[PDB]
């Protein structure tokens, strides 16, 4: 199983490897996937970069 | 954050809805995102559409 | 440019037509990219395929 | 409705906020998807990352 | 690493199992990663929901 | 064809010109595509935002 994490900048290097770890078991466990199958990637995105309802994040509070 | 989990067709319809659970907890434990921010996308592979050293899961002996 | 669209199973074949058109025209008037240089993608999803709050959609009552 | 929009480095901050604001309004009235409820991604592409007819456009004119 | 193919539908079984073969060849010799280190994914669209210049394939005469 | 190419950062630039060149080529003799019509977007994966089996290969050997 592949996983996709996209999130904004500003995580500590702590959370994502407590993201990679808290995920695979979350995929482990709810699939039957055997462990050294699952992926993660992590994908971060750029506040000016993201937008909802028309307008980016850069251009909010 | 987007949570996209891609894995090969056959989980049930009661381990998806337990996927989308857990990591979705996962998420929300391990970077402080709130859950109506987080999201799961959940994308399914055949096996003769998924392939790894040069052969598709569908062509392996 | 490359524009993927992704959203759920439903929209008849002209809201298609009409959101590649409009998509189009919106990325030539707002980027300078010229029209044979720009593609859309339209990726649907099914409701038991997408999940928000740890509930997919297919779940939600 | 999740837009991606994939495109090469080298335009202004101000056409990337129009890109959203146009694309974001061309996916409102063709789909009837509530505003809030589309989401727009930004993602720029490196000339020497993005080949057609196998050459990178880093090693063109 | 990962290669994604994405192609509109139509190739042949046959023709597929070439494409993952060739593909992964060329990124063996190409990047110096090992055969059982190389994924495939093979992605196919309808004529309908891809589009160029405004006009989706399937709707080009 | 769309053709990406994840892979992790410490390839050479002229590694990456090779591999769009074979893997475009690789495309086009098994699926019949045109050459003008092969396109290929390369990924680049940072150790600390890829993992396998719950760790992330920067916090391997």
Do not use: C, W
Not at 33 to 47: N, P, Q, T, Y
């Amino acid at each position: 199983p592949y996983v996709t994490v996209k999130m904004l900048e500003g995580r500590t290097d702590e959370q994502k490897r407590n993201l990679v770890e808290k995920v695979t078991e979350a995929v482990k466990e709810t699939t039957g996937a055997s462990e050294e199958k699952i992926v993660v990637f992590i994908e971060e995105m750029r506040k000016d970069h993201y937008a909802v309802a028309g307008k980016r994040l850069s251009d909010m509070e």
